[PDB]
Amino acid sequence: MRECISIHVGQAGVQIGNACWELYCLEHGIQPDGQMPSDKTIGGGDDSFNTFFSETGAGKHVPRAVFVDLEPTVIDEVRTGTYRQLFHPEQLITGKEDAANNYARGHYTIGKEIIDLVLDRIRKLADQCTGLQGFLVFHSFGGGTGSGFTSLLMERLSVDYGKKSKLEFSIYPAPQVSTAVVEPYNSILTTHTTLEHSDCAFMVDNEAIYDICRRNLDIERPTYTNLNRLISQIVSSITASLRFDGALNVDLTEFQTNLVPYPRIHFPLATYAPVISAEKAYHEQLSVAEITNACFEPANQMVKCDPRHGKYMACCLLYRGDVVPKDVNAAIATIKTKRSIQFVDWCPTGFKVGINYQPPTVVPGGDLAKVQRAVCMLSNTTAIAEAWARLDHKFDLMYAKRAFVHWYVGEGMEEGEFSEAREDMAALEKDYEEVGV
Amino acid sequence: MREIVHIQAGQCGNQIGAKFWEVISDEHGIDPTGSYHGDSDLQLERINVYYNEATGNKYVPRAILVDLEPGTMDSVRSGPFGQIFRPDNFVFGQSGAGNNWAKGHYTEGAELVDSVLDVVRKESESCDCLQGFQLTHSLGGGTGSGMGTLLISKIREEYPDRIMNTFSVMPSPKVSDTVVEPYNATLSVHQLVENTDETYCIDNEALYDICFRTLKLTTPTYGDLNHLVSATMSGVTTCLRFPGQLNADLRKLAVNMVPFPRLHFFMPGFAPLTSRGSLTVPELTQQMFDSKNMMAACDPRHGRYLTVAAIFRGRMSMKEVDEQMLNVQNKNSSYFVEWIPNNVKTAVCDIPPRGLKMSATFIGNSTAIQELFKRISEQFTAMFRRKAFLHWYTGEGMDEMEFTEAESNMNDLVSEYQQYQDATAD
Amino acid sequence: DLGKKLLEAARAGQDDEVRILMANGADVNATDASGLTPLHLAATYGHLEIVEVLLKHGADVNAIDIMGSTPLHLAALIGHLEIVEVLLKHGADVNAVDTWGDTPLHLAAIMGHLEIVEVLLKHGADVNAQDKFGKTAFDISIDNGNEDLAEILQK
Ligand SMILES: Nc1nc2c(ncn2[C@@H]2O[C@H](COP(=O)(O)OP(=O)(O)OP(=O)(O)O)[C@@H](O)[C@H]2O)c(=O)[nH]1
Ligand SMILES: Nc1nc2c(ncn2[C@@H]2O[C@H](COP(=O)(O)OP(=O)(O)O)[C@@H](O)[C@H]2O)c(=O)[nH]1
Ligand SMILES: COc1ccc(/N=N/c2cc(OC)c(OC)c(OC)c2)cc1O
Ligand SMILES: [Ca+2]
Ligand SMILES: [Mg+2]
After folding, report:
1. Strands B198-203 and A92-94
2. How close is the nearest chain B Cα to the Cα of C128, in Å?
3. How far is CA A47 from CA A42, A43, A167, in A?
4. Which end of chain B is more exposed for a tag (fewer CB within 10 A), N or C?
5. Which chain C residues touch B299 with a CB distance below 8 Å?
6. Cβ–Cβ under 8 Å, residues A184 and A395
7. Domains in chain B: boundaries
8. CA distance A328 to B189
9. Is residue A292 within 8 angstroms of chain B, CB to CB?
10. Which positions ≥6 away from A93 have C-beta within 8 Å?
11. Would you say A171 and A235 are in contact if contact means Cβ atoms under 8 Å apart?
């Protein structure tokens, strides 16, 4: 048992964090007041769910989570929602004035006024740990706080916790539900500055989750509720191995070993199946081979791209529910050859498999139907360079005219930081191209 | 970002500022005395943005009234909402300005600026989360233009990080044939280019053409023009006064609408056009981008859109708004700058304005606005070349170089709009 | 010099003083440093009575200043319709051109004095007169989108 601390920054990270922790409580059997009847060891324990929940003397299970935002509106919804009594009151930290969708306001001017308090409160959660292994950080790419404060936080975390792992859940901006025109600028600025301080980052493309909601769930105009319900279901599948017994990705270090061959290319792609509307409650159950096959279909990816284009450097299959091991090996065998799936010449052309024999949990009020078996594939493919090529293009268009740049310079930032960030990006795209495509 | 401080200067500033409080207060269910007679809890969400709670479950508008002419005191005071304002928020002089930008900015109005800052500090000190300021005035007169810009500069010195927002009415000979107004307008534009973050250009030439040629008003009156104004000030401020997705943040609007600091002059538009006693989503969207529905006398088809905001109001299909909006951008892609991706922002609001069930407000940063500035610059140049009435201004201390520097500063502004209208990403 | 007091007298609209100085031999056609006669100033500040009296006492209705402005240029610019007609009644050249190539029609169109436009046209104002930049009264109407002006110039 080694503890993980989850940090949620800005509206995007906070709202998605609220949905995840709700789901965490349902999968583990924790009541919104924090009571876990099925926990015979009151006041403490070495169980696998204790990596995410601490315990009080009175039998309260409190998430090891911290919520930070530069305005209080979104966090106020967390202090008055259902699970208001679950979180530490002092782990919900809010400012007064937000970063105005401005990376510089979140990193230099505004963010600078709360970064010390954020660290102290984090440091309080760490002192309660007997073997902290690292942090999970939820933030948006396009918000001023999600980008600017988060880069600043990551920098501070490498100083005070140099040996601990830092994983990322990042929201990739999509125009169908965007907020700011400068979101490409903030995306590039935070990537470049967080790149050397992040061990592994799972990007969530709002456009991918949006389309999935419209096609599979027949939702005409998906909102942030619908989007986050599905993200929380996928996040749950990535962090399940850390919260349950298992033999694949049991600790944060193992995320890097299996998915990140080289430090800079730490952007694995996540694919999940099946997604079925709760209106089809009597659906026919998909087979282990059916859901497995769907993990190589671009339409189910958490980031829009075409893995047919690139090469695979690592693949992990995390199954949940009624899944017989021999049925997975048979599914792999055929799909290995029945499709143009190309690994790099320098990697063991294999698949890692872990099975959790409990079906996924669904939350009351959600858009998904219950399923007997599901799978989340985590893969590192050079095809996710396509996502970067889309960001960098939108960046280049505006920066060529220097559009919106004065807003950044007037808030402590220096104009040279734009160019070196864009070069760093240009290098990242050639990192994937030197691997193959 | 919450409280905003309203300031109205001069006859036009108070004349359109008063109507603003009459319109929005009716939307928030605030009777003339200040009591909330509304039947919806949404009418009180973002109420503190424009009002104060002064006990008794009442709301005193956070407004400051100024004018060198004491006559404006009676007009506003004797209005249907003249008593809901603070008696302490009345700063009025004994001497007018007489269409002299100099008297308002250098002599008369200057002596009256310190007192105005007093009532401004009184309001800000009592603000729990002050975000910025908004000033209504004309640019042709002497008080609102000459003194209003001086007060803008003073406030910005004390509140340098707050947002300064202005509703500036542009002079037109169609409504007031005074030959010294191009002077005042040009001298003011010189100030507004430096010391404000967002400026709504409300053009008397466009207001007159809408009433005369569209509203069928052979002899339009300041009441007819102000009706179109009041409705526009309510639409552009809808998201600051009611819940919705377009957050409620003057600074996030300025971050997304102003790509270059000097290009912060917005062309408003409103649809449908209505009179004073007197259509689906496709019409609203289409009509919004029609030259006849613009509050500034310029044809958007003559230039390119840098950024655009659209505020829809009323019960309406939300997916239908995303479809039709997406359509006009494609059919009119030649009129948007390609080097600013996703430069169009949309949002709906539930509560529409009185008399209407579904409206739309258009706020555009468009290079075609240079036409408005070309008009004023021509008239300024005609008068300056003859030195007509320059002694009215130099007699108050101004140096002749202020006219030239002001005239050069505006020609540069025009050159700047033209530069990004022909700028291509391919 | 009575020429100097007649310039101020006309500028400030002192009718009684204008009459007095003329009885003592004041130069009705004196000019200031820039070439402005009393008739220029009377036409600028809209002193209709001083304009009619000067014209009855030898004032040159077509005098120009150093910049080429005739009294009718300044009256058309400033927007004094009564004075425009009086000056036209006395042989003022409706198509006089100044050093910017502007005629009386140009200034009236720019400043929006639509009444004065119709009077100049009715007295022979040349609609094909271009300025130093090739603009004519109609061109100014098209470039500024003034529909009222354009219809009047088309008639
Ligand atoms: N999936 C998802 N995306 C969100 C959510 N909230 C915001 N976003 C996305 O995040 C981006 C906007 O960033 P925000 O998280 O709202 O900004 P922020 O971190 O609060 O920073 P500031 O508000 O500017 O101080 C846009 O791309 C949104 O689509 C959410 O609840 N779910
Ligand atoms: N739209 C509108 N414009 C006005 C109104 N009153 C005056 N104006 C314009 O404002 C200009 C005169 O400036 P004014 O405000 O009266 O001078 P001030 O007293 O020094 O501020 C003229 O060009 C008028 O056309 C009004 O009620 N509505
Ligand atoms: C070019 O793309 C964009 C253009 C405008 C955008 N936002 N605009 C607003 C407009 C507002 O009121 C009019 C707000 O109310 C004060 C407002 O507060 C949040 C934002 C957003 C864009 O991503
Ligand atoms: Ca226990
Ligand atoms: Mg925010």
Report:
1. unpaired
2. 19
3. 12, 12, 22
4. C
5. 145
6. yes
7. 3-267, 268-369
8. 72
9. no
10. A66, A67, A68, A69, A75, A114, A117, A118, A121
11. no
Per-residue b or e along B340-375, where b marks 16 or more CB atoms closer than 10 Å to that residue's CB: bbbbbbbbbbebbbeeeebbbbbbbbbbbbbbbbbb
Touch between C and B (at least 3 CB pairs under 8 Å): yes
Tell me if chain B has a CB within 8 Å of the CB of A224. Answer: no
**Alpha-carbon separation of residue A104 from A148, A149, A397, B163 (angstroms):** 6, 9, 20, 17
The experimental technique used to determine this model is X-ray
- Beta carbons of B379 and B182 less than 8 angstroms apart: yes
Place of tokens 């005395």: B33
Would the CB of B152 count as within 6 Å of ligand 2? no
- What does DSSP assign to residue A158? H
**Scanning the structure block, which residue is given the tokens 């009435």?**
B389
CA of A231 to the centre of ligand 1 (A): 14
Query: Distance between CA atoms of B344 and B324, rounded to whole angstroms?
Result: 13
Q: What is the CA radius of gyration of chain B?
A: 21
Homologous superfamily of B268-369 in CATH? Tubulin/FtsZ, C-terminal domain (3.30.1330.20)
Please confirm, yes or no, whether A3 is among the known catalytic residues. Answer: no
Classify domain B3-267 at the CATH class level: alpha beta
Spatial strand order of the sheet with A352-356 comes to: A269-273, A373-381, A312-321, A352-356
Q: Which ligand is nearest to the CA of B306?
A: 3
Q: How far apart are CA A240 and CA A359, in angstroms?
A: 12
Token pair, residue A420, equals: 């070196």
* Residue B198 φ/ψ, nearest 5 degrees: -145, 135
What residues contact residue A396 under an 8 Å CB cut-off, 6+ apart? Answer: A422
DSSP letter at A60? B
Q: Which two tokens stand for residue C28?
A: 């009705």
Find where tokens 């500063």 sit.
Answer: B409
Map out the domains of chain A as residue ranges. Answer: 3-259, 269-386
Residue whose CA is at the smallest distance from ligand 3 atom 9: B253
A99 in Cβ contact with A106 (< 8 Å): yes
Which amino acid, one-letter code, is at A80?
A: T
What gap in Å lies between CA A276 and CA C48, rounded to an integer? 88
Residue in this structure with the two tokens 């959660």, named with its chain if needed = A125
Residue B14: name the closest of B113, B93, B82 by CA. B82
Q: Tokens at residue C103, please?
A: 């005629």
Catalytic entry in A77, A254, A290, A429? A254
Please identify, by atom number, the ligand 1 atom nearest to the C-alpha of residue B252. Answer: 24
Domain A3-259 class, CATH top level:
alpha beta
Decide if A193 contacts A205 (C-beta within 8 A). Answer: no
**How many whole angstroms separate alpha carbon C50 and alpha carbon C42?**
6
Q: What are the φ/ψ torsions at residue A60 (nearest 5 degrees)? A: -100, 135
- H/E element holding C121? helix C114-121
At A188, which helix (H) or strand (E)?
helix A183-194
Contact indicator for B316, B348 with CB cutoff of 8 Å? yes
CA dist A346 and B95 (Å) reads 87
Whole-angstrom Cα distance, residue A66 to residue A55?
A: 16
Is residue B252 within 8 Å of A100, Cβ to Cβ? yes
Q: How many CB atoms lie within 10 A of CB A44?
A: 13
Domain at A269-386: CATH code: 3.30.1330.20
Which residue from A97, A221, A406 is facing B319, i.e. has the nearest CB? A221
Quickly list DSSP for A352-371. EEEEE-SPPP--TT-SBPP-
Contact A71, A98 (CB under 8 A): yes
**Tokens 């529910």, located at residue:** A321
What residue has token string 């706020």?
A: B363
The whole-angstrom separation of Cα B27 and Cα B36 is 11
Contact status of C46 with chain B (Cβ, < 8 Å): no
Give the position of tokens 């008399």: B355
Are B85 and B96 spatial neighbours (Cβ–Cβ below 8 Å)? no
